[PDB]
Write an enzyme that holds these catalytic residues in place. Structure first.
Site, short mmCIF file in Angstrom:
data_model
loop_
_atom_site.label_atom_id
_atom_site.label_comp_id
_atom_site.label_asym_id
_atom_site.label_seq_id
_atom_site.Cartn_x
_atom_site.Cartn_y
_atom_site.Cartn_z
N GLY B 10 -13.74 -37.90 -20.66
CA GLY B 10 -12.81 -37.27 -21.06
C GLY B 10 -12.81 -37.94 -22.66
CD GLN B 11 -9.70 -35.24 -27.32
OE1 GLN B 11 -8.84 -34.42 -26.84
NE2 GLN B 11 -10.18 -34.84 -28.81
CD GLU B 64 -13.77 -29.84 -24.03
OE1 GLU B 64 -13.58 -28.55 -24.48
OE2 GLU B 64 -12.50 -30.38 -23.98
CB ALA B 92 -11.88 -30.01 -15.68
CB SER B 133 -6.64 -38.62 -20.07
OG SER B 133 -7.41 -37.51 -19.55
CB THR B 138 -12.60 -33.67 -17.80
OG1 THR B 138 -12.90 -32.53 -18.22
CG2 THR B 138 -13.89 -34.71 -18.01
N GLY B 139 -11.32 -35.89 -16.78
CA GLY B 139 -10.89 -37.56 -16.35
C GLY B 139 -10.61 -37.47 -14.97
CD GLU B 176 0.08 -34.54 -18.89
OE1 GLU B 176 0.90 -35.57 -18.61
OE2 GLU B 176 -0.11 -34.52 -19.85
CD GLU B 247 -12.91 -66.65 -12.07
OE1 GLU B 247 -11.75 -67.01 -12.57
OE2 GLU B 247 -13.97 -67.18 -12.51
N1 LIG Z 1 -4.32 -43.09 -25.30
C1 LIG Z 1 -4.85 -42.09 -25.63
N2 LIG Z 1 -4.72 -40.84 -24.93
C2 LIG Z 1 -5.48 -39.85 -24.91
C3 LIG Z 1 -6.49 -39.79 -26.12
N3 LIG Z 1 -7.11 -38.49 -25.82
C4 LIG Z 1 -6.39 -38.03 -24.72
N4 LIG Z 1 -5.30 -38.71 -24.18
C5 LIG Z 1 -4.63 -38.14 -23.07
O1 LIG Z 1 -5.47 -36.97 -22.53
C6 LIG Z 1 -4.33 -36.16 -21.92
C7 LIG Z 1 -4.83 -34.83 -22.21
O2 LIG Z 1 -5.97 -34.57 -21.51
P1 LIG Z 1 -7.45 -34.86 -21.79
O3 LIG Z 1 -7.81 -36.36 -21.44
O4 LIG Z 1 -7.71 -34.72 -23.39
O5 LIG Z 1 -8.27 -34.19 -21.02
P2 LIG Z 1 -9.87 -33.59 -21.44
O6 LIG Z 1 -10.72 -34.92 -21.66
O7 LIG Z 1 -9.76 -32.92 -22.72
O8 LIG Z 1 -10.63 -33.06 -20.32
P3 LIG Z 1 -10.04 -31.34 -19.81
O9 LIG Z 1 -8.73 -31.60 -19.25
O10 LIG Z 1 -11.06 -30.83 -18.96
O11 LIG Z 1 -10.17 -30.71 -20.83
C8 LIG Z 1 -3.14 -36.41 -23.02
O12 LIG Z 1 -2.03 -36.53 -22.12
C9 LIG Z 1 -3.18 -37.98 -23.42
O13 LIG Z 1 -2.33 -38.70 -22.83
C10 LIG Z 1 -6.45 -40.62 -26.75
O14 LIG Z 1 -7.19 -40.71 -27.77
N5 LIG Z 1 -5.86 -41.70 -26.79
MG LIG Z 2 -12.01 -32.05 -22.59
#
Ligand SMILES: Nc1nc2c(ncn2[C@@H]2O[C@H](COP(=O)(O)OP(=O)(O)OP(=O)(O)O)[C@@H](O)[C@H]2O)c(=O)[nH]1
Ligand SMILES: [Mg+2]
Ligand SMILES: Nc1nc2c(ncn2[C@@H]2O[C@H](COP(=O)(O)OP(=O)(O)O)[C@@H](O)[C@H]2O)c(=O)[nH]1
EC number: 3.6.5.-
Lengths: 426, 430
Positions: B10-11, B64, B92, B133, B138-139, B176, B247
């Site tokens: 995931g991003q 993606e 996703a 995330s 995705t995550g 979420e 540990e």
């Molecule tokens: N701390 C932190 N959290 C992030 C970051 N990018 C995304 N998130 C978390 O990810 C959530 C959004 O969903 P994503 O993780 O971006 O989902 P995705 O990776 O795009 O995958 P899809 O849901 O399928 O689109 C947010 O609520 C954030 O809390 C980041 O760069 N730093």
């Molecule tokens: Mg994504």
């Protein structure tokens, strides 16, 4: 990669589509001759979404122009950007729809649509990965409504799992540009409530009020309205077409914005909006844009969100922004505006932030709301339809085209069910 | 010898991974082309080729192309192996169904095989690191699935993960809670340990303590990267006391069903305040045990400390450390569960927490990182369950999951498991 097919319905669909492709051509730096003059790679990076690569590298936008009255399409070809579209994707027969939904949908437009679908299949076969389709049209128009409806029907039947959305002009509450409108609106809305994934309601009066008030104008035309709409479109597709934080796919937006399959209807909005010379007294910050976005006056749909509750909200952002300002503003807004949001859906906001702002602005954003004032629209439409239908006014035309009254009855039944379902959750 | 395979899904995971890996590169003196113009504890996290090119051991997965294309066009494109970067044709859509089932299934095999060969290259394998995330489709789904698969395949190999816990007040998506609960269900049934972090708390921390303007995900990911790097630094350098991940598993998991250590990091201060601020181990620990400095929005004073693991870096002498811990022990504002005589373990590392050029964090000759469990997280789980209870009670958005291959019984079961977890925390809290 991810691609979207843009089908332009006749008349307003094609016009708005013209301005749409103008804006997108400006976005990716595409010359009206199809040449790429853009100064960045992000221009051509994923550009395959809305464009195809020719042998000469000239970029043909992916679209299909459909009208029963070629005059508009003739004017489009006469336009500067008319050369972008290959002559093959121009699909038209010659007859008037007479603003008759039945005539367009069932009879003369049905003798057309097959070719349109052929072109659709060509484009779809040329798609690496197809996200979905988009339809720019108008409710109350014979061609737009009938043909658009037939098109989304067939297209969904051909591509059920694919995304399908439409940006549709909705009847004005006070005045009207045509009679018989409630019929077309009702029928189209029926077919639209069952067929599509989502639809964006836009009324010209709202844009007139907005443009006259907010932007302080004098003698502009439909082009500016279409420019605004296309700006919104470009915004969502910008979230799609460029990198950023919380990048939102179209179906992800569709997922977050629709709790209940049958209520997909949305209220588009856009910020910042400022008149020339008044902009100097304004600052560019997320709070400002959010204040504009959640302003009931900036709603591009005719409605008053103060009456209703938000089931879902999606605020897309453009340019360099701090995630903090967004978070804090959304929290504070949702906090103080409580009771304007549905209670059983915590955190009603969907956030997406693109790093690429629109040309000329340091930052920009768009507002997609979901509220029962749409039910109010359905109320007024149902009322007008009932009034016109009770006395069987103009019915003989549709009946003449082979349109059965039971279909009108069914459409009204479904609309009543829809508005009832809007009232059900509130 | 002792090696670990990082994983970024995931991003969030990918960007956090980017920050983590650039920090690694800085710490090991490596540059983006994979060269470094004693430290073989870097060979732990980096393989090598005939040209002396050092490449990271990791697998980036995004359904993606999106971010990973930014990485492919990024500066570190010359670093990562092109195969390690895996991209699908679409996301996703914040739907657990897809990532866990509909999309990832056509991908995850490849990912798994790549992780397998990456594991084959290892002289020995301590475990994995999964960045994602929590609540992101995705995550959530993909890491749940991947954690299941990896759990099946690798057996007793340590599985660690850093997840972004959904904030109580703020949210990036409406769905979420669903993804979160499904995640913790399928993940709890597998994951050995999971580090929870809430962006809101990081915002408060950086703002208030670091005294900076409103930041972005960047320095957030840098902070998370600092924490992770501190852990791996406990592993990646020879200090007075070196600590194996096993540990951490041993100490931070008194019961198998409860592992959710909360991260805290100190000192965190502006470069200007650093001059007036005197950095002592005691004060740092005091800052570490401060509720406002915790990386989650949960208030620790609403629960008791079960296990607490303190990781030290830079210049630290165990004398004043044990003294400081005693000083902490004396304070009853901080309470530990009755059946635990001591929940403390102290790692010691000689190498200080180096700062990133263009970074917002002040340079310090020492730092501390706390990994600890509390029932306030159960409170967090409770609010999560509540939100889910509402949205599920009204059956909102469920049709997506359903049409995409999810069953209602799964949601029910997940919720039941959450209730069980609540009662687990409650009973253990006794
Ligand atoms: N701390 C932190 N959290 C992030 C970051 N990018 C995304 N998130 C978390 O990810 C959530 C959004 O969903 P994503 O993780 O971006 O989902 P995705 O990776 O795009 O995958 P899809 O849901 O399928 O689109 C947010 O609520 C954030 O809390 C980041 O760069 N730093
Ligand atoms: Mg994504
Ligand atoms: N926004 C916008 N709306 C338009 C434009 N042209 C027509 N419309 C709307 O379309 C309606 C007229 O229907 P029309 O499309 O001409 O009927 P048709 O020939 O059967 O498709 C009016 O209510 C207008 O509000 C335009 O250029 N921009």
């Amino acid at each position: 990669m991810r691609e979207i097919v843009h089908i332009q319905a006749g008349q307003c669909g094609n016009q708005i589509g013209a301005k749409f492709w103008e804006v997108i051509s400006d976005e990716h730096g595409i010359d009206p001759s199809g040449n790429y003059v853009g100064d960045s790679d992000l221009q051509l990076e994923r550009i395959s979404v809305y464009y195809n690569e020719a042998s000469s590298h000239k970029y043909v936008p992916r679209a299909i122009l459909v009208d029963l009255e070629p005059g508009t399409m003739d004017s489009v070809r006469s336009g500067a950007f008319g050369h972008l579209f290959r002559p093959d994707n121009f699909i038209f027969g010659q007859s008037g729809a007479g603003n008759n939904w039945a005539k367009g949908h069932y009879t003369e437009g049905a003798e057309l649509v097959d070719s349109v679908l052929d072109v659709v299949r060509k484009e779809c076969e040329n798609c690496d990965c197809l996200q979905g389709f988009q339809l720019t049209h108008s409710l109350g128009g014979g061609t737009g409504s009938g043909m658009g409806t037939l098109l989304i029907s067939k297209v969904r039947e051909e591509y059920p799992d694919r995304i399908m959305n439409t940006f549709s002009v909705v009847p004005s509450p006070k005045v009207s540009d045509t009679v018989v409108e409630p019929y077309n609106a009702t029928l189209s809305i029926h077919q639209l409530v069952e067929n599509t994934d989502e639809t964006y309601c836009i009324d010209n009066e709202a844009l007139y009020d907005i443009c006259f008030r907010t932007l302080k104008l004098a003698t502009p035309t439909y082009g500016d309205l279409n420019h605004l709409v296309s700006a919104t479109m470009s915004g969502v597709t910008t979230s799609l077409r460029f990198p950023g934080q919380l990048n939102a796919d179209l179906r992800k937006l569709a997922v977050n914005m629709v709790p209940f399959p049958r209520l997909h209807f949305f209220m588009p909005g856009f910020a910042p909006l400022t008149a020339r010379g008044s902009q100097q007294y304004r600052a560019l910050t997320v709070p400002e844009l959010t204040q504009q976005m959640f302003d009931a006056k900036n709603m591009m749909a005719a409605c008053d969100p103060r009456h209703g509750r938000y089931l879902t909200v999606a605020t897309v952002f453009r340019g360099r922004m701090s995630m903090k300002e967004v978070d804090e503003q959304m929290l504070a807004i949702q906090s103080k505006n409580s009771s304007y949001f549905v209670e059983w859906i915590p955190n009603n906001v969907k956030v997406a932030v693109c790093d690429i702002p629109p040309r000329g602005l340091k930052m920009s954003s768009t507002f997609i709301g979901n509220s029962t004032a749409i039910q109010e629209l359905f109320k007024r439409i149902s009322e007008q339809f009932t009034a016109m239908f009770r006395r069987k006014a103009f019915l003989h035309w549709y009946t003449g085209e082979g349109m059965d009254e039971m279909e009108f009855t069914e459409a009204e039944s479904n609309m009543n069910h829809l508005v009832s379902e809007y009232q059900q959750y509130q | 010898m002792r090696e670990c395979i990082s994983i970024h899904v995931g991003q969030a995971g990918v960007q956090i991974g980017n920050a983590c890996w650039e920090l690694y590169c800085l710490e090991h003196g490596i540059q983006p082309d994979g060269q470094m113009p004693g430290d073989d504890s870097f060979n732990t996290f980096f393989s090598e080729t005939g040209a002396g090119k050092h490449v990271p051991r990791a697998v980036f997965v995004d359904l993606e192309p999106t971010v990973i294309d930014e990485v492919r066009t990024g500066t570190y494109r010359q670093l990562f192996h092109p195969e390690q970067l895996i991209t699908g044709k679409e996301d996703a859509a914040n739907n657990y169904a897809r990532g866990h089932y509909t999309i990832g299934k056509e991908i995850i095999d490849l990912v798994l095989d790549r992780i397998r060969k990456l594991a084959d290259q290892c002289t020995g394998l301590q475990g994995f690191l999964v960045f994602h995330s929590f609540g992101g489709g995705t995550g959530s789904g993909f890491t749940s699935l991947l954690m299941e698969r990896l759990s099946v395949d690798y057996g007793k190999k340590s599985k660690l993960e850093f997840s972004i816990y959904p904030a109580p007040q703020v949210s990036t998506a409406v769905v979420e809670p669903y993804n979160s609960i499904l995640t913790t269900h399928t993940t709890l049934e597998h994951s050995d340990c999971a580090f929870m972090v809430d962006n809101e708390a990081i915002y408060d921390i950086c703002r208030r303590n670091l005294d900076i303007e409103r930041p972005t995900y960047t320095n957030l990911n840098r902070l998370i990267s600092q924490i992770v790097s501190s852990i791996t630094a406990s592993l990646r350098f020879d200090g007075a006391l070196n600590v194996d991940l096993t540990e951490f598993q041993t100490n931070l998991v008194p019961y198998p069903r409860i592992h959710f250590p909360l991260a805290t990091y100190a000192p965190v201060i502006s470069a200007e305040k650093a001059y007036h601020e005197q950095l002592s181990v005691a004060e740092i620990t005091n800052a570490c045990f401060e509720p406002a400095n915790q990386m989650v929005k949960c208030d620790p004073r609403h629960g008791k400390y079960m296990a607490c693991c303190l990781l030290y870096r830079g210049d630290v002498v165990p004398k004043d450390v044990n003294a400081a811990i005693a000083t902490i022990k004396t304070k009853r504002s901080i309470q530990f569960v009755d059946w635990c005589p001591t929940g403390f373990k102290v790692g010691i590392n000689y190498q200080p927490p180096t700062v990133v050029p263009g970074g917002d964090l002040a340079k310090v000759q020492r730092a501390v990182c706390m990994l600890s469990n509390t029932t306030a997280i159960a409170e967090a789980w409770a609010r999560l369950d509540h939100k889910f209870d509402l949205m599920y009670a009204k059956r909102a958005f469920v049709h997506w999951y359903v049409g995409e291959g999810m069953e209602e019984g799964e949601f029910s079961e997940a919720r039941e498991d959450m209730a069980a977890l609540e009662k687990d925390y409650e009973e253990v809290g006794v």
